[PDB]
Write a protein that binds this DNA or RNA. Structure first.
Lengths: 150, 51, 117
RNA sequence: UUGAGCCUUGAUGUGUAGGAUAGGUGGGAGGCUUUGAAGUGUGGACGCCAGUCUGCAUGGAGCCGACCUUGAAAUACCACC
RNA sequence: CGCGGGGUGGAGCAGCCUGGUAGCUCGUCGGGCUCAUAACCCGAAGGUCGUCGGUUCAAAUCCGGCCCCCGCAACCA
RNA sequence: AAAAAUGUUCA
RNA sequence: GCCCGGAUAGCUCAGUCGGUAGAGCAGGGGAUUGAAAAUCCCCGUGUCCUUGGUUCGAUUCCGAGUCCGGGCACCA
RNA sequence: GGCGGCCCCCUGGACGAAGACUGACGCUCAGGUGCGAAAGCGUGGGGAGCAAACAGGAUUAGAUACCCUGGUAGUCCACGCCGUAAACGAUGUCGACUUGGAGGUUGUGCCCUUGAGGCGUGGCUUCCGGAGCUAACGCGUUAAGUCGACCGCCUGGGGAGUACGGCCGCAAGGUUAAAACUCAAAUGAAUUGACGGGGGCCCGCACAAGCGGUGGAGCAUGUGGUUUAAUUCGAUGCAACG
C-alpha cells in the first residue's frame, strides 16, 4: 500500500515454552476461542510423545521447509515497454506461510476426533499425510519449467 | 549495432544503453516501412534542445 | 568418435523457437535441439529460460566426440540471446569467437505488410 | 559401394533367488602345456560397466574356481548348443 | 392413379435397417450479471413420436387402414 | 500494458 | 477353399534370448476454473481370443481350437 | 508532380564571382498548349517477395472484419492511354518595399593566412519572434505585414459536384454544370465543465493477502406477484424490500 500493516505480537505457549505451539492453537480456533482449541493440541501432542521420546517438533519443521514456494505472475514496466514479469517469493514469507498449512489440513480426514487426526497426521516429516507433500508436486512442477524468469 | 565484448560478457546494460546512447531493438530495416511521423520525432528533439 | 574438439555452434533465436545445432568445421549437422523437444506447452517454447535448457539438452549427445571449444555465431532477434552462452561456457566448452555472423541484407524483397494491431 | 546363404576366426548367453560368464547335456576334478603364477602398471570392450572380457612387460617362482554369493544344484575344466 | 420419401418435445433435426431405451441443436422456462438490457451466466420443464388397429411378453420402431404433405414419372403412333 | 455492443419523446 | 499376418487395460498400441505385463490417449479425481474451458498432475481395469504343454516366471518359446483380416483358386 | 547502390555515355537547370556588352527588347495572362503521385484501362513481356481478389482456420451471439495459414491478378519490364489526390505552406502569379535573433546550407573578398582558424559580403533554407495584421488559432522580411499590376474562383446549408446536355475518354469515367423541392441554420476559432478502452501522477476492504459468511435445507420476517369484500398507503440500483 504505502505502509506495511501487521498487528500485535501473540504470546508464546506458556506451559511448553513455544510460540509455534501457540500459533497452532490459533489455526484450530473453535467458537472464536482458544480454550476448547488447546485441549486437542495437547491431546495429540502426547500421542506423538509416546511414539517419539525425542523431539516430535522436527517432524513439522523438516516437512514444511523442504517446501519452498516461489511462483506467481504479475507485470511491471521496464524501459517504456511493460512485460509480463514472473516474480520470486522472499525466503521469509515461505516460512511464515508453511507453518500454517499442515495444521490447516486437519478436520477433513474423516475421523471421529482431532486426536486420531493430528496425531497420525503430524508425525511424518517428508512422507507426510498432510498438505505439505501435496503442495510439493505443484510448486517445483510449475517453477522454472513453465516459469520464464525468476 | 555492435556491442561485442570478450569473456562471458558481450553486451552492454540496457539501462546505460538508454542513457547518453540508446539501444533496445534492432530490426528496423527488416520490418515494415513508414516515413511521415518517424522523422517528426527528430524535429521534436529540436524542442528537446530548447531551454 | 570423430574427435571434433571445436564444434561450430549455430543458434537462431527466433521469437517462436530457439534452435541449437552443433555443426562440424565443414558446417555439417551433427546434433541439435530446441525447447520444443524439451517439451513445455506450445508457446513456452522460445522463452529465455526454455532456451538455456535447450542448449544443454543438445550438449549431452555430442559429448562422445569431445568438444572443448566453441565458435558462437548468434543469429536472429528473438529471445534467449545470452541464455545459451552461459550454458555453453558452463559445459566444458570455451569461447574463442570474437565476431559473430548474423545475416543482415542491403535489401531486396518486401517484408510483409503485417498486422495493423 | 552395398545387402543376403555358408564357413573360418572372434564376442554376450541374465528360467525363483543368485548383481554376472548357472544357454543346456554329456565328459569332468589337484599342480606344468613350458607356460596358467599373481600382483603393480600401460592400452581396448561392454550396463554382464560390480563382473569379466581382452593387449604387453617383470615374473619359466605358480593361478585358483568350495566364487564373492544364493540355491535344489555353483561357477575349474573339456566336448558342445 | 401408380411408384418412394417423410410426419418426433414448440422449431429445425437424431434414434425406426435391426420391435423394448426418445436423444441432438435451437428456442421456451426460473434465477443471475447490468444502472437497465443484448451479449453473457447458471439451473429446470417439455413429445397420444400424424392418426386408426394388427401380431406379440414387447410397436415411434415391424406389417397393414385412412389423412393430408412432399417427391419421380404419367409410355411411341 | 489480457477481445466486448446498446440506450423511446419532453426542463 | 487354401497360403500368409492378427486376437493385450475403456480407447488405442507396444514389448522381454524365459526375473516383471507396461505405454500413449480419452474419462473421472485433484492444484483447476475467460462461465465452462484451455493450461498442470495421478492412477485404474488383463487366459495378453480359448485350449493346453515346456516351465522355478512365458502375449512373452510353441502344437491346436475359435474368431478376424489381407493375398491367391475364383471352383456346377 | 516528384527524384536514392555503382560506373559510363547523352543532356538541362541553378547559383556565385569579376568584368564586357545589349539598350525597356518587358510583366502577368481568359482561351489554348505542355507536364501529372498512386491506382485503373489497352498492347506486349516477366514472375522473387508482397499482396486486391479469392480459399481455408480462428474469434464473435452473428464476423462478407479486425486475427492466423495460404494465395491470384496486380505490383516489376517495354509501349500507349486515362488525367485525379487532404496534387497542402490546406496560403494564385509577378514585381517593389518593412523590426530583428539564433541555427542550417552553399559560393566568393579579405586578416600577424599568422590557428584546428578571425573578419566581411552574396545565393538558398529551417527554427524563433517584434511591430503590425488576425475572429481567434496564429502568420510574421521566404507574411496572413505594407503597396502595386494581372488572372482564377467564392456569395447560407441540404438537394449536388447530383441531373440534363455538350465536350473529352477505349472503357472506367473525367469536364462543364443546374433546377424543382427542402431546413433555420450551416460554419470557423477559442472558453468552462463532464467523460475518454487519452497520458502522467496518488490513495481507500477497491483490490490483493487472509478469515468468517450467503446462495443449499427448514423455520422467522419483509417484499413483489397473485388472490380477496379488503388484502390501506408510501419506499424502488447503490441511495426501497426485519
Amino acid at each position: 500500500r504505502r505502509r506495511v500493516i501487521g498487528q500485535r505480537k501473540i504470546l508464546p505457549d506458556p506451559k511448553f515454552g513455544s510460540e509455534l505451539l501457540a500459533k497452532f492453537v490459533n489455526i484450530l480456533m473453535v467458537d472464536g476461542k482458544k480454550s476448547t482449541a488447546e485441549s486437542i493440541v495437547y491431546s495429540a501432542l502426547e500421542t506423538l510423545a509416546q511414539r517419539s521420546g525425542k523431539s516430535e517438533l522436527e517432524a513439522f519443521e523438516v516437512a514444511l521447509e523442504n517446501v519452498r514456494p516461489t511462483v506467481e505472475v504479475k507485470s511491471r514496466r521496464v524501459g517504456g515497454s511493460t512485460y509480463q514479469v514472473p516474480v520470486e517469493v522472499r525466503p521469509v514469507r515461505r516460512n511464515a506461510l508453511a507453518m500454517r498449512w499442515i495444521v490447516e489440513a486437519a478436520r477433513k480426514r474423516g475421523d471421529k476426533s482431532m486426536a486420531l487426526r493430528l496425531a497420525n497426521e503430524l508425525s511424518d516429516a517428508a512422507e507426510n499425510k498432510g498438505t505439505a507433500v501435496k503442495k510439493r508436486e505443484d510448486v517445483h512442477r510449475m517453477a522454472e519449467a513453465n516459469k520464464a524468469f525468476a | 549495432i555492435k556491442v561485442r565484448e570478450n569473456e562471458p560478457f558481450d553486451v552492454a546494460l540496457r539501462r546505460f544503453k538508454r542513457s547518453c546512447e540508446k539501444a533496445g531493438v534492432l530490426a528496423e530495416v527488416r520490418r515494415r516501412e513508414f516515413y511521415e511521423k518517424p522523422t517528426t520525432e527528430r524535429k521534436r528533439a529540436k524542442a528537446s534542445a530548447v531551454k | 568418435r570423430k574427435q571434433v574438439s571445436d564444434g561450430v555452434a549455430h543458434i537462431h533465436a527466433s521469437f517462436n523457437n530457439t534452435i541449437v545445432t552443433i555443426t562440424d568445421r565443414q558446417g555439417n549437422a551433427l546434433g541439435w535441439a530446441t525447447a520444443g523437444g524439451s517439451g513445455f506447452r506450445g508457446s513456452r517454447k522460445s522463452t529465455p529460460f526454455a532456451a538455456q535448457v535447450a542448449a544443454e539438452r543438445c550438449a549431452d549427445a555430442v559429448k562422445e566426440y569431445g568438444i572443448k571449444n566453441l565458435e558462437v555465431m548468434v543469429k536472429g532477434p528473438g529471445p534467449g540471446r545470452e541464455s545459451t552462452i552461459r550454458a555453453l561456457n558452463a559445459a566444458g566448452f570455451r569461447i574463442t569467437n570474437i565476431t559473430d555472423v548474423t545475416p543482415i541484407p542491403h535489401n531486396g524483397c518486401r517484408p510483409p505488410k503485417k498486422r495493423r494491431v
